[PDB]
Design a protein around this ligand. Structure first.
Ligand SMILES: [Mn+2]
Ligand SMILES: [Mn+2]
Length: 269
């Protein structure tokens, strides 16, 4: 069976309870994770250890907090106490865990299930071949010996319009923002990087990226996390928002793909 779970954010206990609820069995089942495995919750270290241990039984995409963790680890960004990352950073296996984490994809594709996963979704300005190429570009940087310079470069909110003619840092920054930070678009598909509220609270003419017909969404289902104030609701058919804010005291949600059956685990507050 195929299980998809949204942003875990270090909520290891809830993760394990949800997986026991479905009798998740490595070797017979596969787990898809939308990213943001770490930060806010208390068990980032345990989460990373367990997910890494699953090997081929897990298909992960990196989110924005995974990338921030990598930036703290390389000395690029400052650690926030609120992120609760110090046990993970001071772990004796920190190097192993994080060199594994930076080698994971930004994008997961399963042709037989017609299923695409990215942390934030798929911008409507992209077709599938382009999404793939951009994922491969950023992934090559992340898994190279020079990933700290990339992490330093990734911060920024422009450019917000895609073009195959984009180059260098602007290209990397747009790819990163589209995959890990996207929520609302302008009618032409151009990215907005300031509104994090629910679709009903955003001012016109902003709409969710998925309310704009895009070539990928026309042929594929798309699962994603990241956008907690969506609360998993309001998506069109074929769009699955899996982040229900477990680390914020909401719930951790698991979707079984074969029957589209939802299983939910309350936050441990
Ligand atoms: Mn996120
Ligand atoms: Mn998140």
């Amino acid at each position: 069976a195929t299980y998809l779970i949204g942003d875990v954010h270090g909520c290891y206990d809830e993760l394990i309870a949800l997986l026991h609820k479905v009798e998740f069995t490595p070797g017979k089942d596969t787990l898809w994770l939308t990213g943001d495995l770490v930060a806010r919750g208390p068990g980032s270290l345990d989460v990373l250890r367990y997910v890494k241990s699953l090997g081929d039984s897990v298909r992960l995409v990196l989110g924005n907090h995974d990338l921030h963790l990598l930036a703290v680890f390389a000395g690029i960004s400052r650690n926030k106490p609120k992120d609760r990352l110090t046990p993970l950073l001071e772990a004796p296996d920190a190097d192993e865990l994080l060199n594994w984490l930076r080698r994971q994809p930004l994008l997961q594709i399963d042709e037989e299930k017609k299923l695409v996963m990215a942390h934030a979704g798929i911008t409507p300005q992209w077709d599938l071949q382009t999404a793939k190429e951009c994922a491969r570009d950023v992934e090559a940087v992340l898994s190279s010996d020079s990933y700290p310079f990339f992490l330093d470069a990734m911060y920024g909110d422009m450019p917000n319009n895609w073009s195959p003619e984009l180059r260098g840092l602007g290209r990397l920054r747009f790819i990163t923002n589209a995959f890990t930070r996207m929520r609302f678009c302008f009618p032409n598909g151009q990215l907005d990087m300031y509104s994090k509220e629910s679709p009903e609270e955003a001012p016109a003419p902003l709409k969710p990226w998925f309310a704009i017909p895009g070539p990928v969404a026309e042929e594929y289902s798309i699962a994603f996390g990241h956008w907690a104030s969506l609360e998993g609701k309001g998506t069109p058919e074929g769009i699955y928002a899996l982040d229900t804010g477990c680390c914020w005291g909401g719930t951790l949600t698991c979707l079984r793909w074969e029957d589209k059956q939802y299983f939910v685990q309350p936050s441990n507050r």
